Amino acid sequence: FNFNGLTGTGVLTESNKKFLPFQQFGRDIADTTDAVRDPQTLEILDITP
Amino acid sequence: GKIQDSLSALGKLQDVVNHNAQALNTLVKQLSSKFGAISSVLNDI
Ligand SMILES: *[C@@H]1O[C@H](CO)[C@@H](O[C@@H]2O[C@H](CO)[C@@H](O)[C@H](O)[C@H]2NC(C)=O)[C@H](O)[C@H]1NC(C)=O
Numbered sequence: 001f002n003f004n005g006l007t008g009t010g011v012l013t014e015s016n017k018k019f020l021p022f023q024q025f026g027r028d029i030a031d032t033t034d035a036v037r038d039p040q041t042l043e044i045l046d047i048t049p
Numbered sequence: 050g051k052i053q054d055s056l057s058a059l060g061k062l063q064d065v066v067n068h069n070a071q072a073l074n075t076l077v078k079q080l081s082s083k084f085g086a087i088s089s090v091l092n093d094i
Contacts (some may be wrong), residue, residue, distance in 0.1 A: 007092040030074075031081040 001047075003036040008047065015046040 001008055006025065017035050019026060028034040037044050083089050 030077040 004039040006033060006036060008033065010047040010049055012045045012047060015044040017044055017046070019044055 001010070001012065003025070015035050017026060019035075019037055023037070025033055025036045033047065035044055035046050081089055086094070088094055
C-alpha cells in the first residue's frame with residue numbers, strides 16, 4: 001500500500017480510532033504507523049504486519 | 050497465620066520483570082533514530 005506518501009506493507013482492516021479533521025495517521029507507541037486515512041474517502045483503516 | 054498479614058516483599062520478583070520490560074521497550078524505541086542519516090524508515094530512504 002501507499003497512502004499519499006506513506007509506503008508500506010500489511011493488511012488493511014476497518015478501524016475504530018478517531019482522527020479529528022486535522023489528523024492524518026496515528027502512529028503507535030514505539031513510533032510506527034498503525035492507522036491511516038484514505039486520500040479521498042476519509043476512512044480510517046488499521047494496518048498490521 | 051501471621052505470615053498472610055505481612056503480605057496482604059516481592060520486589061525482587063518484580064525487578065526481574067521490570068528489567069526485561071525496560072530492555073524490550075528501549076530496543077524498540079531505538080528504531081526511531083536517524084544516527085546522522087536522512088530518515089529512519091528503511092522505505093523512505
Ligand atoms: C475526487 O473525484 C472522485 C471522482 O471519481 C470522487 O469520487 C466520487 O465521490 C462522490 C462523492 O462522494 C461519490 O458519490 C462517487 O461514488 C465517487 N466516485 C467513485 C468512482 O467512487 C472523489 O470523492 C473526489 N475526492 C475529493 C477529495 O474530492
